[PDB]
């Protein structure tokens, strides 16, 4: 049966496919052939621009026009053509080569030099750079902006919930009070950390030739330094320079990228589980509309997808850097999957966003929940005792905590203590709700 | 960009799609809806068959026929229509109910009972069964056949190469010889162990209720036994029963299934790697001086297989863990049931293609064998030990030291205290002559 | 800094090491040399048994006495002697070999045959059977008993709370009522499944010799049938037999076993998180209430994570060995118990966690009484049976719910009065569906 | 059965545990107690040193001296005492407090402030910083030195062998020639790339108290800035500050760490494997031809995977804790030095293996000498330069079963139409001088 969203095996190209559309221009075969074409053209132009090669004479403005436009206007029909040529070639890169060959066929300047397309390059010279462009383009145009959307969402929830008291939960149970603003502030913080780390990750490439030794480049063209040629070329593409390679690129940097992305996804998983929890306690209710509990599912699915993402992200990151000797092709097919994990991630991200849009806080439920546990108020008293020398605070506080613990019992206990009456007054001005320690200011320090 | 095999973000529906097309009728959304319609229809049919339920009267051949054809003739436009009934439901399982009602409103008998569709059913009552049908159907129509073709390729090689002596590699270094056929035979054995293991795995399903206690069922129909209803209904689908569940089937059996599949995948990775090594050793040549054979289909296999496991294991580890009576993290996860099976598919096909290309180089293996005569030290020790000579290892710490040949072996042999029959036996020995029992071991696979 | 529970890097032989003591006779090096010695000895014995080998005559009752006692009494000092021989020999199997040849010389009839020890065998022939004995022993004497204890704990919670009604949570929000006994019974059922499965798993072994072809065996003794020898020996060791093999046992059965174990562990993780939750809602208390600290369940959770980590890794990596073999597995197998150990620390902990559990009835009942919206479900079905128009619109409009709200709404409909007395009978507490009898049929 | 390296379940404290001895002072319960005592003592010190706290007046060096000698001179029996106190308290953190107070009871100056030990802190304030010191300590003192030793080993294999020609293998089969030096140089480059990263990884601690809001701190001493207090105190430890936290540090930097470490481990896995391969080709030999055992690369390769499994697990699970915390991490953090532990063993083994490596130059040169077909490519390229039509199919018209030698190439290119300079350029080419730029890249690694 023909391919559609209904007939698709993978939900990424499946029911969730219209979310991931931006990756169809990148990690698909269309992206592969696209960046292959770009890189090949850039390679030819780079040749013609070198004075030491008289075989490719420097291009006129118009021919450069045809090439640049060939790279910029590249579309799905062209990819189709390459795929059709691949039937005859049986090599998918040589198919690109022929595609370009027949595209320049009518332009004398280009056709005459057309045999210098993919000159001295091995296939992975084109492939690894195509990949690099895939991952970089994805990172900047897609991933990072989403990370920013989520981050800003959590920051928003942090400013909105800033002064809202909350009864904290340690090993599932009531604990020293906080605010939701802060609980979001932490997530935002860690997310920002990973963001930074991901923007600082290196993205690497090479054209080294066959084994990386510039063998045929130098054998054919001793007049050139192909090291400088290679650096200039790889840097010309907006990529980073990896002078030491076997036939392939060792792939370490993709392990790095996917590691970071995985960390982010993990933090987000923690967030989704936590919000799932807060909803379970009815700390959250549905927002009114123009179109009531919140169905958690937006986060749920997100969580469910995030792991899946990691599942792939990890594996590649683990597998790719290992390739037998000078190379094995086990990586090639795997490198077709670069955008699957990311895809999952994307979905998850969006889901979370949606979830956040549905969230409204339930204030009076939290206020009451705090009102009903006055035991958290033992602690600050204890400290204020530990300062003034009152002996065995943990011994004396048991005379209270086990069991009514109202505000009356509390203030009575505080009255029965030996203490400067200013501290008595203060302690007696305490409520579990009002007592956040430093939360709010910390929430405000985030920006 | 519109969705094509070109614009697919993933190679499964991507470049490798024409391989996995068989899964499109199972694990896709189309398969999900297909088995949902199947389950709902069959369920209403059981509702009708029952004597205790008089509100749903028995069907004559006409309506039963219309339903059977509803299930069997279910197609892509039906599913597309169900997808169109969304944007309304916002609920994916309810769209099926609407679809069934409207489909069925033409025939009066099913028309008047049409509100008994999905009766006292939670969504997951349908979903889990649909998944079970997915897995069973995939296993029967795809997985096992392919496993069999693989084991048959491996066994083919085993039989062809049965008599062909091979210099073994331990620590990638020369060891006591063998036949290539034996080395294939082993992988075949492991494979078929995993095969009989997979055929023997339970595909589980349960329809009980929202929380699994048959609440609403008893609420409406207290005089009906819903446990017998459950067991019967689940077995009737070719599934097997889980009496005890929460709102969801706990998913353990999918963990088990994907675990077996993952083990098979592992064995096949061992095989692909090994054959890669043999090709690298120039032990294999091209089918028709000899020509190099390019083991891409093996690499392409071993690259995909791992990926397969990567997802498989995940669904094995993640799925069974669900908060309290349930959380929906599985709902989306279970749409991925076909991914690792897809990768596995592609790897299987690849490996088959790569075995199709295999020729053996006999002159080479014999040359290599004859260049290592040191392996004949071992059988000389053992005999020397049986006949009571002392310090055999140290006495062969004489013979080992230039490189060994047949002449030297004969000198050493004659230099020893042995029954002379045993001597001549030892001198009858060559690296190729010493395969142990391997030939008969290949012969004995049944 | 010599070795103590204190100075240990790993908590397995570390702080948690007095839990794992049962595994110190199995998966350690002491265990390794123990089972190696056993396998070697019995190999010798079986060589003596065979009639076609006259070079070692049969063992009388006394020599079998010395060998059997040699194997049975194996202690740490013996293992230290072996370990000492390992310095001179620099092959850890050859030290066991020299240790047996050494010990056996007390008896003349054995010393005569001392050179038939490890005859035709290759190291892995001994090592792999040693592993088999390791995993079998571990399974029967350790793992299965615990699994049974846990299962019986959960079952006890099931029989206890069987009648106790509980408000369900689907995606964390309230749902159709149930009993705790049920939710415990499900866990008990899954655990039962994995228990049966772990019982079913094969423990595999071989002595095929060097590369698995019986090269040397056949070279020395073309008379003997060494396949019957392999089968007979391997089965006599209590181990199931793998006929087709390279220098190593492919380890697949270890993958199967560890897979089952990890599945069980995962079930247990689900359980622990679930009890964490139930406690977090104050559904559980100690034995005014008293909050119970759910520490044993978290410490179970983590160590289960680690356990599954190791078990998984070994299961996936082990079966892959390059060509006829690579020795990468040789070291990894020293970790066969590691993951298991982790599991142990969980199994015990969860137990200690369950012993501290007592249910809060009043809390559950008061939670149920504050949700009558669950009763929205059953009514609907009844409405659907007697053919009331479009129920879900009506009910979903009808709902801040009371008893009288319900009673009123039920009286607002056209149904047999029988069904109105049936429905007016229901409370969210009263409405458990079939749960009780479902619990009753567990065992 | 008493604990000895013999009875140990794990080889880390087991058979392989004499290699890991360093970690015994870091990641153990001993190290936990040591660093705990350290951070508690320093906490008390900073408490005293603060003016806004009058109830802990500034120490003399008659006092802080004793404290410092408490931290620095810590030994095994202090840890033992603390353990015996954990026997009575049942809380393992409280025993550091008791121990500290029974140590301090003698000096009345400290004994009088002794109730301020661990003031306002909650257990993970101590624990997390203890962890930070564990990781940093191991990282500077243990891990990095080893990474350096390995990087230098490989660098030496690269610089020694730089000009030794080697026939490359892509998909296992002969490819464009290279040098050993280049092939090791790659590994060196990657390894260093990781080294820098691990060195640049942040290490974090918090000490904000219970939920991280400084609740009790401000309760007792509202006048102080405890954010200042926190930043300062955490930076004074040699660690980096994490202002935003729940009861526990998120354990992200642990993820980063173990990710980098796992990456390095993976590079070393690739290396061990490749070397295993080269040894399998007889490309390496012993040192005063003798056959070499790759048991060290098999051991390293073996333990690295376990290391990555553990580290990976800690990295994935640790950062996830329910709400303000779950204690599932508390036990898991006892395992911090397990993964590293494995790594350590590996790191050693590999080195040992590298110490056994000699190159066989003759074997390599000969294998190259049988491989002349590799010289095809350069010719093609040259042919493509001077415009010779369809170059690649002009060759490959040598698939000939006369194979290929120097005379064949010579004659062939003699037939070609080329300026004589390029002809003799190509005739001068042999597989062994065709290594290209390898030697200069190796040189430039410096």
From TrEMBL, chain A:
Catalytic activity: N(6)-(1,2-dicarboxyethyl)-AMP = fumarate + AMP; (2S)-2-[5-amino-1-(5-phospho-beta-D-ribosyl)imidazole-4-carboxamido]succinate = 5-amino-1-(5-phospho-beta-D-ribosyl)imidazole-4-carboxamide + fumarate
Metabolic or biological pathway, per its Swiss-Prot or TrEMBL entry: Purine metabolism; AMP biosynthesis via de novo pathway; AMP from IMP: step 2/2; Purine metabolism; IMP biosynthesis via de novo pathway; 5-amino-1-(5-phospho-D-ribosyl)imidazole-4-carboxamide from 5-amino-1-(5-phospho-D-ribosyl)imidazole-4-carboxylate: step 2/2
Domain Adenylosuccinate lyase PurB C-terminal: 323-436
GO BP of this protein: 'de novo' AMP biosynthetic process; 'de novo' IMP biosynthetic process; purine nucleotide metabolic process
Domain Fumarate lyase N-terminal positions: 14-304
Highest taxon, organism lineage: Bacteria
Keyword Disulfide bond attached: no
Known EC number: 4.3.2.2
Swiss-Prot/TrEMBL keywords: Lyase, Purine biosynthesis
InterPro entries registered for this protein in UniProt: Fumarase/histidase_N, Fumarate_lyase_CS, Fumarate_lyase_fam, Fumarate_lyase_N, L-Aspartase-like, Pur_lyase, PurB_bact, PurB_C
Family under the similarity heading: Belongs to the lyase 1 family. Adenylosuccinate lyase subfamily.
Matching NCBIfam families: PRK09285.1, purB
Subunit structure: Homotetramer. Residues from neighboring subunits contribute catalytic and substrate-binding residues to each active site.
Function, as annotated: Catalyzes two reactions in de novo purine nucleotide biosynthesis. Catalyzes the breakdown of 5-aminoimidazole- (N-succinylocarboxamide) ribotide (SAICAR or 2-[5-amino-1-(5-phospho-beta-D-ribosyl)imidazole-4-carboxamido]succinate) to 5-aminoimidazole-4-carboxamide ribotide (AICAR or 5-amino-1-(5-phospho-beta-D-ribosyl)imidazole-4-carboxamide) and fumarate, and of adenylosuccinate (ADS or N(6)-(1,2-dicarboxyethyl)-AMP) to adenosine monophosphate (AMP) and fumarate.
Stated name of the protein: Adenylosuccinate lyase
Organism: Salmonella typhimurium (strain LT2 / SGSC1412 / ATCC 700720)
Protein encoded by which gene: purB
UniProtKB/TrEMBL annotation, chain B:
GO cellular component annotations of the record: cytosol
EC number: 4.3.2.2
Catalytic activity: N(6)-(1,2-dicarboxyethyl)-AMP = fumarate + AMP; (2S)-2-[5-amino-1-(5-phospho-beta-D-ribosyl)imidazole-4-carboxamido]succinate = 5-amino-1-(5-phospho-beta-D-ribosyl)imidazole-4-carboxamide + fumarate
Domain (Fumarate lyase N-terminal): residue spans on this chain: 14-303
InterPro entries: Fumarase/histidase_N, Fumarate_lyase_CS, Fumarate_lyase_fam, Fumarate_lyase_N, L-Aspartase-like, Pur_lyase, PurB_bact, PurB_C
Domain of life: Bacteria
Keywords: Lyase, Purine biosynthesis
One Gene Ontology biological process: 'de novo' AMP biosynthetic process
Residues that span the membrane, as ranges: none
Domain Adenylosuccinate lyase PurB C-terminal as annotated: residue spans: 322-435
Pathway of action: Purine metabolism; AMP biosynthesis via de novo pathway; AMP from IMP: step 2/2; Purine metabolism; IMP biosynthesis via de novo pathway; 5-amino-1-(5-phospho-D-ribosyl)imidazole-4-carboxamide from 5-amino-1-(5-phospho-D-ribosyl)imidazole-4-carboxylate: step 2/2
Alphabetized GO MF terms: (S)-2-(5-amino-1-(5-phospho-D-ribosyl)imidazole-4-carboxamido) succinate lyase (fumarate-forming) activity; N6-(1,2-dicarboxyethyl)AMP AMP-lyase (fumarate-forming) activity
Signal peptide from the UniProt entry: none
Enzyme class: lyase
Subunit structure: Homotetramer. Residues from neighboring subunits contribute catalytic and substrate-binding residues to each active site.
Role this protein plays: Catalyzes two reactions in de novo purine nucleotide biosynthesis. Catalyzes the breakdown of 5-aminoimidazole- (N-succinylocarboxamide) ribotide (SAICAR or 2-[5-amino-1-(5-phospho-beta-D-ribosyl)imidazole-4-carboxamido]succinate) to 5-aminoimidazole-4-carboxamide ribotide (AICAR or 5-amino-1-(5-phospho-beta-D-ribosyl)imidazole-4-carboxamide) and fumarate, and of adenylosuccinate (ADS or N(6)-(1,2-dicarboxyethyl)-AMP) to adenosine monophosphate (AMP) and fumarate.
Entries under PANTHER family matching the protein: ADENYLOSUCCINATE LYASE
Family: Belongs to the lyase 1 family. Adenylosuccinate lyase subfamily.
Protein name as annotated: Adenylosuccinate lyase
Organism: Salmonella typhimurium (strain LT2 / SGSC1412 / ATCC 700720)
């Amino acid at each position: 049966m023909e391919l559609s969203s209904l007939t698709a095996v993978s939900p990424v190209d499946g029911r969730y496919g219209d979310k991931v559309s931006a990756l169809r221009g990148i990690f698909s075969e269309y992206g592969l052939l696209k960046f292959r074409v770009q890189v090949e053209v850039r390679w030819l132009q780079k040749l013609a621009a070198h004075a030491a090669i008289k075989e490719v004479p420097a291009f006129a403005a118009d021919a450069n026009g045809y090439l640049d436009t060939l790279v910029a206007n590249f579309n799905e029909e062209d990819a189709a053509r390459i795929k059709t040529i691949e039937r005859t070639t049986n090599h998918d890169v040589k198919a690109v080569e022929y595609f370009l060959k027949e595209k320049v066929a009518a332009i004398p300047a280009l056709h005459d030099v057309s045999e210098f397309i993919h000159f001295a390059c091995t296939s992975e010279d084109i492939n690894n750079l195509s990949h690099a462009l895939m991952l970089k383009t994805a990172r900047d145009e897609v991933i990072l902006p989403y990370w920013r959307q989520v981050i800003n969402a959590v920051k928003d929830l942090a400013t909105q919930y800033r002064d809202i008291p909350l009864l904290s939960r340690t090993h599932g149970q009531p604990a020293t009070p906080s605010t939701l603003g802060k609980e979001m502030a932490n997530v935002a913080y860690r997310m920002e950390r990973q963001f930074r780390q991901l923007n600082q990750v290196e993205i690497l490439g090479k054209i080294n030739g066959a084994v990386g030794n510039y063998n045929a480049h130098i054998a054919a063209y001793p007049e050139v330094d192909w090291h400088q040629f290679s650096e200039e070329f790889v840097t010309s593409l907006g990529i980073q320079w990896n002078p030491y390679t076997t036939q392939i690129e060792p792939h370490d940097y993709i392990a790095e990228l996917f590691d970071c992305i995985a960390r982010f996804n993990t933090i987000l998983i923690d967030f989704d589980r936590d919000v799932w929890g807060y909803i379970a306690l009815n700390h959250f209710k549905q927002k009114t509309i123009a179109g009531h509990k919140v169905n958690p599912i937006d986060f749920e699915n997100s969580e469910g997808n995030l792991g899946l993402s990691n599942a792939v992200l990890h594996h590649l990151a683990n597998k790719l850097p290992v390739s037998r000797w000078q190379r094995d092709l086990t990586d090639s097919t795997v490198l077709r999957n670069l955008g699957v994990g990311i895809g999952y991630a994307l979905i998850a991200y969006q889901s979370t966003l949606k979830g956040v849009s549905k969230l409204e806080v339930n204030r009076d439920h939290l206020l009451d929940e705090l009102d009903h546990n006055w035991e958290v108020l033992a602690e600050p008293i204890q400290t204020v005792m530990r300062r003034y020398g009152i002996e065995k605070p943990y011994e004396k506080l048991k005379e209270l905590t086990r069991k009514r613990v109202d505000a009356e019992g509390m203030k009575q206990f505080i009255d029965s203590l030996a203490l400067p009456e200013a501290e008595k007054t203060r302690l007696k001005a305490m409520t579990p709700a009002n007592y956040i320690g430093r939360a709010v200011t910390l929430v405000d320090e985030l920006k």
